[PDB]
Design a protein around this ligand. Structure first.
Ligand SMILES: *[C@@H]1O[C@H](CO)[C@@H](O)[C@H](O)[C@H]1NC(C)=O
Ligand SMILES: *[C@@H]1O[C@H](CO)[C@@H](O)[C@H](O)[C@H]1NC(C)=O
Ligand SMILES: *[C@@H]1O[C@H](CO)[C@@H](O)[C@H](O)[C@H]1NC(C)=O
Ligand SMILES: *[C@@H]1O[C@H](CO)[C@@H](O)[C@H](O)[C@H]1NC(C)=O
Ligand SMILES: *[C@@H]1O[C@H](CO)[C@@H](O)[C@H](O)[C@H]1NC(C)=O
Ligand SMILES: *[C@@H]1O[C@H](CO)[C@@H](O)[C@H](O)[C@H]1NC(C)=O
Ligand SMILES: *[C@@H]1O[C@H](CO)[C@@H](O)[C@H](O)[C@H]1NC(C)=O
Ligand SMILES: *[C@@H]1O[C@H](CO)[C@@H](O)[C@H](O)[C@H]1NC(C)=O
Ligand SMILES: *[C@@H]1O[C@H](CO)[C@@H](O)[C@H](O)[C@H]1NC(C)=O
Ligand SMILES: *[C@@H]1O[C@H](CO)[C@@H](O)[C@H](O)[C@H]1NC(C)=O
Ligand SMILES: *[C@@H]1O[C@H](CO)[C@@H](O)[C@H](O)[C@H]1NC(C)=O
Ligand SMILES: *[C@@H]1O[C@H](CO)[C@@H](O)[C@H](O)[C@H]1NC(C)=O
Ligand SMILES: *[C@@H]1O[C@H](CO)[C@@H](O)[C@H](O)[C@H]1NC(C)=O
Ligand SMILES: *[C@@H]1O[C@H](CO)[C@@H](O)[C@H](O)[C@H]1NC(C)=O
Lengths: 157, 420, 198, 49
């Protein structure tokens, strides 16, 4: 039985007649006792403020604790090339787990908005004394291009 | 048996009879709406082949289906994030509840954020979260908005609702003592403010009792969040089905690719690889199609949730049964693991009485119609009241208007009209 | 990028068509992506086997594209139903629904064409220049409780007036715009004042 | 009713369960659609004679 993975000491207890051990998905998990855990893998994302704005990029490894391999660790994985700032700005590039990036490349926690406390009290109200006429633009698609495909000509030609 | 449609009753309908309630009930009902689902990313090359170069080569010569599937899953994930943002991130400011909780007897501690820091969640939100229980190229992308941030959005919306009514949903928040807010809401459903200003203590007690009934229902009665649990179960079932299908023979000599490669010569190895690739690719197509359909359904549900937030929460809705059964008063949002919970506060008539009506009054050879309300008589005494509550008033020229003589109106009666 | 939604729709459609064209020239496990060379090189059994393989692959690609188009068409139909509803109660009338046709109190809307969609210019009312006033649920006069017919009782510090909810139009308290619905012994927050009788 | 089909489909996978689950979900959804549309009330009122 050939494969790729990390050999680890196993705390589980086998039986003399048992040689392999398979978890859910009927894949090899433990072999005679040593546990088989495949080495770390995941996706790689690139955070950039656009080519025109800057030529600097940051690399995000998701679901990978890249301490083994400007380093920041988030619930979404780990980030390389960004300086962690403790400020609160509006999100520009959504990284994940409440963390965003903005342009040097900085990483921070999302600012949910301006925080204000209404002066709430009995026998007091706030009444406007002026009005504003505001025009707001909303865009809604109504239709798309009508495309017809002849399967006989497409498949055969 | 044969199911019964409900209680069978006959309503006493007469051409001169009405039933007007003499009492009311403040009922709080719960509505559950999914907002988003788990963001799952599938690496097609890793799923189909599992870090084998030759299977990857046969896959890339096969076509570019992997790019299409990755694009579809990425679009699904971005759609989920947009759904969460549109439902929750609506208000542009984070409103904070003042420390002095003087709401005219209306208790709100069960839905307000708890100062004891239970992840900045209300006690009802804590029960809602506790009630629902949540390796081959399959990854779960975390949501952009964390649970705490969702809780902060809900708390900000709730604080703006209490301290400002519907004003903060249309511009800058304006403070209001929350009693005249209830009076305004009663005015919206057709009840004069005097009903509130007479029975404020009873209304507050009924509202607190209704909140407590919701407390008990969430604490004891289970399966109150069946929709979110069903969505999670369907997603888990689909993912598990894909995982199980990863280990299908598909007509090949083995379901393990590595065993095939270490046992069989390259021509026969690659034809078995082709069979496995066809099967796994078909399974992944099926999974992606179901995921797209489910994502469309979840997007429709999230659009509905955003509409409910904007109409029921940020204002008072005149739509019937859109924000709960009965005349809707207000709504409170609560965060859920993959959705939202709406606590709809509504007005329900009760304690009805019979009355005799007449369309108009013929006085001095003139027909008098009510400005607002209805003419009702108990015994031999005639009065005018309002439609949703029994508040009889003496018929007077101020609250009645004259239109023509009393010869063309059908059902007009003879009565005196007081002239002050 | 003001019209980014329509641009996204047309880009998605163009990407789908381009992917279909690219998949047309894919090998699909055969010897070549061109069928004429297969005809001119192989004997009829092997030729029909490769043709069958190419037919299966292209049929799968076409079904995938058709399914994606059906899903996108359903989404566009939902968006168009939403657009028709917005036109119906925002251009053909005024909508009392909150945030359906703009942020604020909707006044009216204007539709404009767009290459594959519609654009609504929502004219809405937004309050501004808020000022703080002192209020009371009712007014006690002659041992009776007066409530406003429409509006709210406010005070600027010395005198009490009645105004409307969305704008500041202070008016003297009068029996014409106020109604009596009881006494002053039950209303919480009652304030003594006089009501002018004309 | 051919045993060879079962023999060649047991190794093919569990697509039959997927299709049956999809159809069952569709059927439950139609029942729910009718239930939601038509049962807006819990009392069967009758017109007076
Ligand atoms: C950035 O934008 C500029 C001007 O808008 C353009 O000339 C350039 O091609 C873009 N990207 C690069 C390569 O800087
Ligand atoms: C990475 O692992 C270290 C120790 O092995 C642990 O302290 C840390 O929390 C992990 N980081 C994450 C969140 O993956
Ligand atoms: C925020 O972060 C900086 C650098 O990461 C660190 O000094 C500290 O934890 C925080 N600084 C302040 C001023 O709170
Ligand atoms: C209201 O604002 C307008 C400009 O938008 C200004 O001309 C006017 O003076 C303001 N009215 C008051 C009462 O301040
Ligand atoms: C309405 O019902 C409450 C109890 O639910 C009762 O205390 C009250 O007296 C009732 N109102 C009238 C007018 O009888
Ligand atoms: C609201 O209820 C909580 C517990 O249910 C209680 O501790 C609190 O005192 C109540 N507030 C008021 C104003 O009665
Ligand atoms: C009052 O109405 C109820 C139902 O609407 C009816 O059962 C009852 O007979 C009526 N009472 C009188 C005195 O007509
Ligand atoms: C009808 O009800 C009114 C209550 O406003 C009462 O004054 C009157 O005596 C009643 N008439 C009869 C005949 O019961
Ligand atoms: C109601 O119908 C009866 C017939 O049973 C008739 O005698 C009476 O005049 C009608 N009253 C009105 C107000 O229409
Ligand atoms: C009302 O009074 C007038 C004049 O007395 C009379 O002609 C008419 O019949 C009366 N109408 C009814 C419905 O009693
Ligand atoms: C007074 O008015 C301002 C703005 O006009 C408002 O934001 C605030 O809540 C009010 N109350 C104060 C400052 O006590
Ligand atoms: C309130 O306004 C009235 C008239 O509008 C004026 O007589 C009075 O002086 C004002 N009081 C204050 C405190 O501004
Ligand atoms: C407002 O509340 C305070 C205590 O918070 C109380 O002393 C005062 O009488 C109240 N005023 C009104 C009009 O309700
Ligand atoms: C209002 O006036 C009456 C008598 O004129 C008095 O009994 C009552 O205490 C007054 N209320 C206030 C709040 O001044």
């Amino acid at each position: 039985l050939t494969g790729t993975g990390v050999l680890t000491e196993s705390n589980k207890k086998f039986l003399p007649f048992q040689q392999f051990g398979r978890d859910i998905a009927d894949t090899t998990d433990a072999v005679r006792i040593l546990d088989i855990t495949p080495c770390s893998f995941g996706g790689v994302s690139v955070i950039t403020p656009g080519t025109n704005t800057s030529n600097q990029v940051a690399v995000l490894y998701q679901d990978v604790n890249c301490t083994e391999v400007n380093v920041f660790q988030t619930r979404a994985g780990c980030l390389i090339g960004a300086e962690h700032v403790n400020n609160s700005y509006e999100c520009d590039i959504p990284i994940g787990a409440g963390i965003c990036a903005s342009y040097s490349i900085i990483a921070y926690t999302m600012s949910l908005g301006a925080e204000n406390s209404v002066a709430y009290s009995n026998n007091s109200i706030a009444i406007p004394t002026n009005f504003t006429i505001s025009v707001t633009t909303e865009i809604l698609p109504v239709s798309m291009t009508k495309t017809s495909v002849d399967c006989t000509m497409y498949i055969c030609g | 048996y044969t199911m019964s449609l409900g209680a069978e009753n006959s309503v006493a309908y007469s051409n001169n009879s009405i039933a007007i309630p003499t009492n009311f009930t403040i009922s709080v009902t719960t509505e559950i709406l999914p907002v988003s689902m788990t963001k799952t990313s599938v690496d097609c090359t890793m799923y189909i082949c599992g870090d084998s170069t030759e299977c990857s080569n046969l896959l890339l010569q096969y076509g570019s289906f992997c790019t299409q599937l990755n694009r579809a899953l990425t679009g699904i994930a971005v759609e989920q994030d947009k759904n969460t943002q549109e439902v929750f991130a609506q208000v542009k400011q984070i409103y904070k509840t003042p420390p002095i909780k003087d709401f005219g007897g209306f208790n709100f501690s069960q839905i307000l954020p708890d100062p004891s820091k239970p992840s900045k969640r209300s006690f009802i939100e804590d029960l809602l979260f506790n009630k629902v229980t949540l390796f081959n190229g399959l990854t779960v992308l975390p949501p952009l908005l964390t649970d705490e941030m969702i809780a902060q959005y809900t708390s900000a919306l709730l604080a703006g609702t209490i301290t400002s009514g519907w004003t903060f949903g249309a511009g800058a928040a304006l403070q209001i003592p929350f009693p005249m807010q209830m009076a305004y809401r009663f005015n919206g459903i057709g009840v004069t403010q005097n009903v509130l200003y007479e029975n404020q203590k009873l209304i507050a007690n009924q509202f607190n009792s209704a909140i407590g009934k919701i407390q008990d229902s969430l604490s004891s009665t289970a399966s109150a969040l069946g929709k979110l649990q069903d969505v999670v179960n369907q997603n888990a079932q689909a993912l598990n089905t894909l995982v199980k299908q990863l280990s299908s023979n598909f007509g090949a000599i083995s379901s393990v690719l590595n065993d095939i490669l270490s046992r069989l010569d390259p021509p026969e190895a690659e034809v078995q690889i082709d069979r496995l690739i066809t099967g796994r690719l078909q399974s992944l197509q099926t999974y992606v199609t179901q995921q797209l359909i489910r994502a469309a359904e979840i997007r429709a549900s999230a659009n509905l949730a955003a509409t409910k937030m904007s109409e029921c929460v940020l204002g008072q809705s005149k739509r019937v049964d859109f924000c709960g059964k009965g005349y809707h008063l207000m709504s409170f949002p609560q965060s859920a693991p993959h959705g939202v919970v709406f606590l709809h506060v509504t007005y329900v008539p009760a304690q009805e009485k019979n009355f005799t009506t007449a369309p108009a009054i013929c006085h001095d050879g003139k027909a008098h119609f009510p400005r607002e309300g209805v003419f009702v008589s108990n015994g031999t005494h005639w009065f005018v009241t309002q439609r949703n509550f029994y508040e009889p008033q003496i018929i007077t020229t101020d609250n009645t208007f004259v239109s023509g003589n009393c010869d063309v109106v059908i059902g007009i009666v003879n009565n005196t009209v007081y002239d002050p």
